[PDB]
Amino acid sequence: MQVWPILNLKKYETLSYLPPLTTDQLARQVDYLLNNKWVPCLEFETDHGFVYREHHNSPGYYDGRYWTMWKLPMFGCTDPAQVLNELEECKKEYPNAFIRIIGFDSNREVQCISFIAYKPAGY
Amino acid sequence: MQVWPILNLKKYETLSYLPPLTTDQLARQVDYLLNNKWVPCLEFETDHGFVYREHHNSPGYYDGRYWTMWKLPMFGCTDPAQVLNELEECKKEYPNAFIRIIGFDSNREVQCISFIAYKPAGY
Amino acid sequence: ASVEFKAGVKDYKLTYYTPEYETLDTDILAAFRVSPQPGVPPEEAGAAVAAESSTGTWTTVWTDGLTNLDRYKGRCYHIEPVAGEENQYICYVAYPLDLFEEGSVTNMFTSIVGNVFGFKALRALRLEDLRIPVAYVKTFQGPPHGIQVERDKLNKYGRPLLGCTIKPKLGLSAKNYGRAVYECLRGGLDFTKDDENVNSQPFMRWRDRFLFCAEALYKAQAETGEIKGHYLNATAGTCEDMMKRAVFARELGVPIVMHDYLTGGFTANTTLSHYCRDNGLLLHIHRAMHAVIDRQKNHGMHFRVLAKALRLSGGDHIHSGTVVGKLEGERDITLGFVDLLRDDYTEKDRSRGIYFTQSWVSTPGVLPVASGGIHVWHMPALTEIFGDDSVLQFGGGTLGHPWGNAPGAVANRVALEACVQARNEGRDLAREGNTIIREATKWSPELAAACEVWKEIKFEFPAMDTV
Amino acid sequence: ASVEFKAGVKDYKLTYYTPEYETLDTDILAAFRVSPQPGVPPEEAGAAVAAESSTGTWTTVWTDGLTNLDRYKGRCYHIEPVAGEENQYICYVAYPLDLFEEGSVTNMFTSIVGNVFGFKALRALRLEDLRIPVAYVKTFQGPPHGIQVERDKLNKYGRPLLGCTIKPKLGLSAKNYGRAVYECLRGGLDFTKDDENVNSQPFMRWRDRFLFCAEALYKAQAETGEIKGHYLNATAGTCEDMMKRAVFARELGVPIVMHDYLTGGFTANTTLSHYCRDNGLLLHIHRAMHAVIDRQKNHGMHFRVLAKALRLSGGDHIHSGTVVGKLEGERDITLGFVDLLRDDYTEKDRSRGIYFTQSWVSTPGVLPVASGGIHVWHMPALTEIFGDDSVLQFGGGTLGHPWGNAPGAVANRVALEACVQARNEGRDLAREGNTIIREATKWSPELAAACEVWKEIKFEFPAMDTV
Amino acid sequence: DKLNKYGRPLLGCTIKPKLGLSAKNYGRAVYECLRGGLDFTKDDENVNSQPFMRWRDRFLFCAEALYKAQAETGEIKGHYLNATAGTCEDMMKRAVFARELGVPIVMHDYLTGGFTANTTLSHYCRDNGLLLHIHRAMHAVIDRQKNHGMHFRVLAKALRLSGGDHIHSGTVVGKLEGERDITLGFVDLLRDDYTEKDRSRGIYFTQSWVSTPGVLPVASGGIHVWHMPALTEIFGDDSVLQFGGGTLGHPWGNAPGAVANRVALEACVQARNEGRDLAREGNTIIREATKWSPELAAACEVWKEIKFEFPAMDTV
Amino acid sequence: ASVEFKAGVKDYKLTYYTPEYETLDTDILAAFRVSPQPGVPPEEAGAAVAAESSTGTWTTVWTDGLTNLDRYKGRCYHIEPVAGEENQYICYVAYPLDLFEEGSVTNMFTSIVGNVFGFKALRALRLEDLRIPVAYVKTFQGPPHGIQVER
Ligand SMILES: O=C(O)[C@@](O)(COP(=O)(O)O)[C@H](O)[C@H](O)COP(=O)(O)O
Ligand SMILES: O=C(O)[C@@](O)(COP(=O)(O)O)[C@H](O)[C@H](O)COP(=O)(O)O
Ligand SMILES: O=C(O)[C@@](O)(COP(=O)(O)O)[C@H](O)[C@H](O)COP(=O)(O)O
Ligand SMILES: [Ca+2]
Ligand SMILES: [Ca+2]
């Protein structure tokens, strides 16, 4: 039997327990986002990469949930290259940042997609 | 579209989104203080440059507001050179301090001026 | 319009069988499966049920002249024979809006299901479905949070949530509960839970349990960086006990509590839904006892009725069956009521056992929870049946992994994320599931050990409640 | 005593079928009617039910080694075939005392009836009876007052009590409710009542109702000189609503309130029993919804189980059926559970559907309430079946008398006192009932009119739940 | 003194779509606006608690957001959390929860909630140290017409009595009506201790306030960066300037909208304090600041021609 | 269904004048008497009222893309001229049920009569009537007793 590790095993919600996504693997989630007519958005975070409680500890309140918005939601977008381009731009501007791709459904007003698309060095 | 930066973008209230004040620019704010007959005071802070909540988190309570007063409020002052002189003295005594100039209206008992006049190295 | 008072008994169908009636958009509509005794017209059986579930009794009372009995009466307005049954009929009843107490699931069940199932003149009776009009919908809080809010609170998107009941159902001490909890959450499950009948007992007192499971869960969050919860059961003997568990949960700062709505009861449930809305606690509903009422085709209340009343009373989560596991749940029926649980509009659909079109006027949807003898091999089928807005709950599928809780959790979390990825890529979960799972074991030795243990385990029997 | 951990699924009968087991006097004992699927040994079906109602799940979990699974486990310790049924067995289960939360009917039902009735491998399942050990009995308050105290409070001895539901079940205004109430109490009924589904509605708001029915009942007491009550329904959507009705009843100074224990729910019931004990209000229990669970032989929970749990939770009164009226109730079964409701000791008796000897360690007895399509002609049979410690309740039998409420009440009160006198004199109520009633009409023209109206009315059908 | 903000008008911003945004999206929009240099953001008047967004959820996420803004920028922020509600008990539950999260400022719609319930809230915020921002929704039902109703100076004086730290006061130059002279009028009534009779500005009586604290006027409604000069000259330092559409309508999104706004305002304050004439040199001062602020430049291109000029109804 | 974000101002009637709309039995319907300035089409005056009492402001905001603005927007769905008045119109507005707080008169009036009566582009405005759908009616207690009980 194996012991599941303890140190440096920070995880990043959906997809983070699979092998790192390949370039195509990455493409395919982006297509999946766009095939469901959801709106792409990028978000990034330099300082607080994981949730914490600084300002309150009542039920349902966590810090570190909000990241910062890269540019605006890509409304209209039908081209995955557009999204992967913006990922490259965000990366070049913020190479010490975690960067995630999210996908909005506006009918339900819920994020239907959210995954990590880039982690900084040592991550 | 540009993404407003995230790291090292601490701001210092009034005037702190402008380009740094020139020596003349600085003089002009001081004249403005003195032409409204307001009382110059300088204040400095080495340790806690920005607000934080150590001792309480009730509504309206922040730490880090109070800085420490350089000498007294310059009552009577009609000369701007006097004030810029004290700025220079404070700076020589406290080169690792943020220093601000403030202006008191005694009729309303409110500060009507307040701006940063010196930041330490890396700021 | 007055007529003299004539004491004595008449047929119910004289007043309460009204075939030509056009239902109003404010009426509550019931669908009964009715099995009359020999000798009893379906009309009169239909009529009986409507009368004694709304205004009438077994003989004429004079006090009806004081009111307008036409505007208050329940009405049997349509009968239809049941296919492949001797002497069995669907009877529809409309109940006017005024009959009901605003915001009380208790009062709606007290009329509609109060006394009629014991009538001598029926062999059997079963409430199949109910049409709650929108103006009655608006009198209830509903779910404290609902799917959108819950996902935004926990920061969890793109997949089903994963849960795990602590096992031995009973007999573990507090500190051991806490130990099991940390181990399970740190391997990738989002939630763990009190077993339904774990309340407070001689082997484990509640306040001790809550305490340690807080430490545990706060340690798993800290190690993994993803938000965790553990369903702390508020179920209790009295309302005052229940409220004491909630308030202590609140005071610990954790995200979620549970309640056993039917064995606690709708009056106390509603109370607890209210307090979690005021206090921002998520509310996981357990449906223990439901099968006492809802198993048989011929007699009882369908689970879609209990779920609708849960959505009114309030739950963020409800168990919904698994289809594939150790408890009964037919796929088509299950798709049915799940749709009733999460969506805003659901059209009539007899193939899925929806007898009424149902609107919810933006009452938040409820997250279905699949739990009960499932394991990694069922992952594909579960993801396909329920989709992303579900909680998948793996008790013996976690704690029975050969390598302990952490690795059991990893196996289940990996199998799930392999099915999501495969799905999102365009693969067919129903066709390719065993394969997908197979592929994932090549790189996850946690999953591989799970897969080896339970390879042959299936649960397939003749179901009882079918369409 | 330790053994290595071997993950994977085994038979339940390996751990949970224990035929040689001698029950302990602290154990809770369940009697299940079990109908296995084809292919499923009665042993393994028995075992399944015991395991998943106490400690076990569908695969081996390692965490059992942390505890002493032998002392906590539910146990199937006896199977016996069912007479005149293919593939149906009584299975007995013993549950240790530690499994249960002291004073919570909710927790005892959550284990014993929580999940097992939905098992795929069963066709059907039914809890017939439960043996609550005395040390568990002592953890409950029971009835707020109980028969002795109730009779001493109201000053009413030597006869059944007489009641009357107000009719039209719904749609009467407050002031009209109050009018009907005064008229009914002033002709000789001891009590009148809120109909179960009369809570607070658009046609009649609760606080208005309580108010006027106080005036009414205070006027009937004043005119007749005997103590009256009117069952003011506290049933409500939430505990806080419920408690508000109780507290206002308390504030009016009246003797008695009611509660719909199953549609309100055991958590809220228990709360209300507590408050009436602290506040000296009598507590009349309505059993609305019971027939949803308890009608069928093959699947559900027998009413004797619901009654026992009511006696623990707390009720001064519970409905118990009438035998002779419009709702189903077999005489022998009914004698059975009535005995379970009022007495301190009740020996095993399969002929009356008592599977267990049952002791109550002076927990007060509960008064049975017969209500539901009865009338003056049933008086003799009712008095014979139930005896003095009962409440006889005549809704359409009061308000459907041709001469109005007062005279309907007199008819029923006279018929009852004629049956008492005749009984006390040494006459046979079963043999001489029609006669006795006949004699009494010669001097009571109220009774005579009742008798003429309902002379032919009988309710006789094939029953469903039999022994 | 509580917020540590001196020497300029404060800046705020109403979250848009007025209705129909969820709680987590409200928090998202808030964080972005405050981090770009706005002092405050706010519940739209008619955002209370609804099917698309329940209040307790909103407060919680806007706390999270605002605490992240503050921490990134180091300047104190606030978000007016609307206590307006159906009953007093509901209202007081919202104030109590704002108190508990430790934020600085709540709001109330004084006329549709009503003076009784306002005075109750004003009391609580005193006893609990919450700032209290007053919205004046419905006022124009009573105060638009010269011939019939009640002038808005009357409602403002009553709000001063009842209690508000902030009230909306009109803008003059935006999408809602307010004549300059009458506006300088009642703004004086709201802030100063003594205000002499002056029929030219619609003050019919001399009014003293015996040191009742003055109320910060809030200019909001159809304004943008080109109105910055005028606003600064009309209201001076003791004002809150509020830019909903003017923040969330910026092409580059909230943070940049906020920056354009706060840049324009500090440029008018710097210009002013140097001795320039805001009424004469406004377009120029704004023009100059776009040369070094690309955020401002984008705002200024979008709304260059937008003006709001009609015959007013309430005049002297 | 998504379209790119185009900042800047547009006519209100482009989003909130909706003449072919069939009112829902849950909507809240408002009857306004509306007197536009010179130069202002009734259609745009009606639309302004509907927008600025429900979801919209004076310039396009990107955050609309995050919701479904069609299901929340107030909608001017009928204009009729007023007899014996120059430039005065009845404008009908429908408000979806989701916009309102249950049981709060204060919330209904804050949307519906909050801001619109001060709009520079109107000379005058008057709310004549409101159609309160029954599902909203049920959220209120109403009269404490009412006529029957009182007597
Ligand atoms: O005790 C149990 O049996 C369970 O925890 C399953 O444990 P395993 O995860 O070990 O199966 C669940 O409560 C049942 O699934 C309830 O069924 P339902 O969801 O249909 O109400
Ligand atoms: O509504 C009714 O039907 C009753 O008032 C009878 O009215 P009548 O007196 O007019 O028959 C009783 O509640 C039922 O008897 C309940 O049955 P049970 O006692 O078996 O629970
Ligand atoms: O709903 C609106 O229309 C506003 O948020 C302005 O939003 P924009 O920032 O997007 O214009 C303000 O509440 C009005 O200004 C109220 O007017 P007043 O202050 O005159 O009472
Ligand atoms: Ca369980
Ligand atoms: Ca009844």
Ligand SMILES: [Ca+2]
């Ligand atoms: Ca607004």
